[PDB]
Structure 1
Amino acid sequence: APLAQRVRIMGGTNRGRAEVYYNNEWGTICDDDWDNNDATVFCRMLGYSRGRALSSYGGGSGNIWLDNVNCRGTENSLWDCSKNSWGNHNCVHNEDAGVECS
């Protein structure tokens, strides 16, 4: 491993705006229907075991890629979740969803 893989942060929280990489650009997730099940799926992708949804975390820019995300909670990826068409939203970045992963 690189040295970069020989450090880690344990027993705390990673909290912030949830972003997703689609069509070669980072974009954000509207908080419409964004819930703990969605947050857990998102956080699982980063190797965490639980996510809590933070409504209207805000602060993003550019594309809003996802809206009305409706995960069962058991998906390995947001790509497996039911949601609006990618890039189909009626949102602004004040509504950008966040997560507290742990």
Structure 2
Amino acid sequence: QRVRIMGGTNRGRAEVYYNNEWGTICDDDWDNNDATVFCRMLGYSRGRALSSYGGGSGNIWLDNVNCRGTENSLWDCSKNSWGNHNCVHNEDAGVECS
């Protein structure tokens, strides 16, 4: 269950490792609860959702992520099935963690 931030230091595009590849997360309904779960996987306390951070390539793995904000992992969150999306990479979600 691997995640990474690509862009800056405490902010960047939210990427997830699945199906043997680092892929991106479409921003449809991506909010602070989702960003918070994601940031907490990387040792931050909380996150703000960045809509259309953009700039990723390859597979878009997730869309319509619906975390309560309390999960220990993104994998425990309600979300579309893996690789099910109607997105482009301009719409890649990001996070600003603290």
TM-score, length of structure 2 as denominator length: 0.91
Q: 1:22 to 1:13 in 2, by over 3 A?
A: same
Q: 2:15 aligns with which of 19, 35, 50?
A: 19
- Counterparts of 1:1-102 in structure 2, within 5 Å, are 14-102=10-98
SS of the residue aligned with 1:70?
coil
* Partner-residue secondary structure (3-state), 1:57: coil
- Runs of 4+ in structure 1 off by over 4 angstroms are 5-13
The 8 Å contact of residues 13 and 100 in structure 1, kept in 2 or not, is answered as no
Gapped runs of 5+ residues in structure 1?
A: none
Distance 1:13 1:68, change over 3 A: same
**Structure 2: gaps (5+ residues):** none
Matched residue count: 98
TM-score (norm. length: structure 1):
0.87
Which protein is bigger by CA-based radius of gyration? 1
Q: Distance in 2 between matches of 1:40 and 1:84?
A: 18
Tell me whether 7-16 or 81-90 shows the greater mean CA deviation: 7-16
**Distance (Å, rounded) in 2 between the aligned partners of 1:90 and 1:6:** 23
CA distance in 2, matches of 1:84, 1:94: 19
Deviation of 1:93 (Å):
0.1
